[PDB]
Design a protein around this ligand. Structure first.
Ligand SMILES: NC(=O)c1ccc[n+]([C@@H]2O[C@H](COP(=O)([O-])OP(=O)(O)OC[C@H]3O[C@@H](n4cnc5c(N)ncnc54)[C@H](O)[C@@H]3O)[C@@H](O)[C@H]2O)c1
Length: 326
């Protein structure tokens, strides 16, 4: 049978029953290309991969039989799909499984910044004693009233729309910037749309990123862009690290130009509070790229990825594929 390999993973239990009579399945548990055994490079007809490994043109050229790559997730910026397309390699993803999980994690981070739950809990872990009202106000200093605040969403796709709908219920004003959507999309949803990134940053009290990382938005938030944000604004990023210049963010947090930030993604992952530009940045909440996760979402995307692999080997590429992103 054809060989299909899980590149940056070791567990294939969910995929096995779906691919049993279709392909030989093997895993590499690789963090890089040089960790992928020769057999895979030479014979692999298909590959399943998460977001922890990157495939450049050089890497893709090492596979000699590879005809399809399936990202067990939605973002495929860790792959050079254009070169994959040149090498005759179809690339697909699983766009729907974690939409709600990610939007809910986004709202969690937004609420943690406004309500300071994570920081208040920590203050308590460190032994802070809050006996009087004066003490309560001091320890919770910065906790804000949400109603009336403007939430600026950058990228109104699947997650952006889910966040917008949830945000409305807390009394947030929502605004969004998304240069690729057709006009009128904002009407059906009852949201306000702005024409440029600068307008969105200028009017938002809390900015949330929900765009895919592409060739035109690397470091969308940088030293120039950060200066266009309101004083004391919050930044939330559960989209892609690299959309944000950590150096510009660190300074901003240190200078107080940005009151706080919540990041589930970072320029360099895995993330560490002892390494990088955010080394000793104040008011920073971080999570290990886990916004997408729930037991149900994980199983859902893995079985969908498995089926897509099955369609590619049993059917016709790219005709039989449901989510090829070319
Ligand atoms: N950290 C996580 O766990 C996790 C899980 C799922 C998705 N994500 C990420 O969240 C993002 C949104 O995914 P969806 O929500 O699933 O993706 P999507 O493809 O449905 O929507 C992305 C939206 O961004 C818009 N966009 C692209 N470039 C833009 C720019 N420069 N400015 C404004 N808008 C821009 C697109 O037109 C599109 O509407 C992606 O980057 C995805 O990789 C992260």
């Amino acid at each position: 049978m054809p060989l299909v390999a899980l590149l940056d993973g070791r567990d294939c239990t969910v995929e096995m029953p779906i691919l049993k009579d279709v392909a030989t399945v093997a895993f590499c548990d690789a963090q890089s290309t040089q960790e992928i055994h020769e057999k895979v490079l030479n014979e692999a007809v298909g590959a399943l991969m998460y977001h922890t490994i990157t495939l450049t043109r050089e890497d893709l050229e090492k596979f000699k039989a590879l005809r399809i790559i399936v990202r067990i997730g939605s973002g495929f910026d860790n792959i050079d799909i254009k070169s994959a397309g040149d090498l005759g390699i179809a690339v697909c993803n699983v766009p729907a499984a974690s939409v709600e999980e990610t939007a809910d994690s986004t709202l969690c981070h937004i609420l943690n910044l406004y309500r300071r739950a994570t920081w208040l809990h920590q203050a308590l872990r460190e032994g802070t004693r809050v006996q009087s009202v004066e003490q309560i106000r001091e320890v919770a200093s910065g906790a804000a009233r949400i109603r009336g605040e403007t939430l600026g969403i950058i990228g109104l796709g699947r997650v952006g729309q889910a966040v917008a709908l949830r945000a409305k219920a807390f009394g947030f004003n929502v605004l969004f910037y998304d240069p690729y959507l057709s006009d009128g999309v904002e009407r059906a949803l009852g949201l306000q749309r702005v024409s440029t990134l600068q307008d969105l940053l200028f009017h938002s009290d809390c900015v949330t990123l929900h765009c895919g990382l592409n060739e035109h938005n690397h470091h969308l938030i940088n030293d120039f862009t950060v200066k266009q944000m309101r004083q004391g604004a919050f930044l939330v990023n559960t989209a892609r690290g690299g959309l944000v210049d950590e150096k510009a963010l660190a300074q901003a947090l240190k200078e107080g130009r940005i009151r706080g930030a919540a990041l589930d993604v970072h320029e360099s992952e895995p993330f560490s509070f002892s390494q990088g530009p955010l080394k000793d940045a104040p008011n920073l909440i971080c999570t290990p790229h886990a916004a997408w996760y729930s037991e149900q979402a994980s199983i859902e995307m893995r079985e969908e990825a498995a089926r897509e692999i099955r369609r590619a080997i049993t059917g016709r590429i790219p005709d039989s594929l449901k989510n090829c992103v070319n």
